[PDB]
């Protein structure tokens, strides 16, 4: 199927509690594979998946150096953002970055990203064209002009079309037995009366990977979107995910309802019912 690689940075100032903390986490799809934390005794990029462990010492040195330099750069970025927003030195602030690439089944680039946020709001983002920027406001326009003069977008485009795609191809192969294995959801429908004349039908999906799934209820074949209670997809802690969808139905009419499940791990989409 299709895959993503993403790096996520968080830089968080903490006046009175030391210098700003810098963290990087790297993912392939929903699998964490590397982490860096400036608060560690020996700050370094650490492997978090067995398929990256096989990377040699030259990989860890290069990756650690990028993150050590980023710790210093992002502390500067936090001071610049404070100045651009006329803020005092007393409060805690956060810069986030998410960058990386999506590829299709043929390994080719679908799209790239390089997005930044300040205090949970958009700051600046590379457009999908990989050649221009969207600055959220007049503060971020200053960074935009600096990055336009330094031809940052051209450098991002080269990385996103090149090393991003190539390292995702390498990682997907080295980790093919996990990264390229879609685990289908294990499903069941529960029944709970809510009154003498209505019941809850809850359709469960457990043990699936990746997180992407569609769970819907139908009445005679019609979608019940506005009357379905959904929970956000949640991690089980063993790499897999969980989700449920529930509908309130008249007692004695349970057989009119079908739960529909779509997931990459299934040979065919499922159509389920409550089994009394």
């Amino acid at each position: 199927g299709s895959h993503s690689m993403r790096y996520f940075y968080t830089a968080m100032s903490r006046p009175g509690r030391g210098e700003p903390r810098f963290i990087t986490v790297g993912y392939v799809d929903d699998t964490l594979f590397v982490r860096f934390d400036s608060d560690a005794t020996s700050p370094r990029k650490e492997p978090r998946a067995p398929w990256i462990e096989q990377e040699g010492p030259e990989y860890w040195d290069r990756e650690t150096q990028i993150s050590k330099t980023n710790t210093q750069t992002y502390r500067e970025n936090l001071r610049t953002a404070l100045r651009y927003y006329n803020q005092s030195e007393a409060g805690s602030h956060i810069i986030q970055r998410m960058y990386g690439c999506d590829v299709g089944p043929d390994g080719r680039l679908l799209r790239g990203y390089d997005q930044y946020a300040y205090d949970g709001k958009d700051y600046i983002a590379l457009n999908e064209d990989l050649s221009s920027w969207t600055a959220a406001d007049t503060a971020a326009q200053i960074t935009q002009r600096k990055w336009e003069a330094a031809r940052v977008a051209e450098q991002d485009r080269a990385y996103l079309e090149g090393l991003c795609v190539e390292s995702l191809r390498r990682y997907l192969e080295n980790g093919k037995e996990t990264l390229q294995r879609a685990d289908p959801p294990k499903t069941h429908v529960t029944h709970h009366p809510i009154s003498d004349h209505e019941v809850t039908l809850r359709c469960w999906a457990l043990g699936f990977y990746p997180a992407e799934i569609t769970l819907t209820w139908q009445r005679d074949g019609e979608d019940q979107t506005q009357d379905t209670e959904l929970v956000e997809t949640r991690p089980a802690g063993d790499r897999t995910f969980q989700k449920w969808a529930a509908v309130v139905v008249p007692s004695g009419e349970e057989q009119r309802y079908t739960c529909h499940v779509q997931h990459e791990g299934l040979p065919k989409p499922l159509t389920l019912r409550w089994e009394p």
Binding site: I66, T73, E76, T143, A150, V152, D156, S167
Partner: peptide, 9 residues
Amino acid sequence: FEDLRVLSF
């Protein structure tokens, strides 16, 4: 592999 290029805000 991360991008090694860096320039501040």
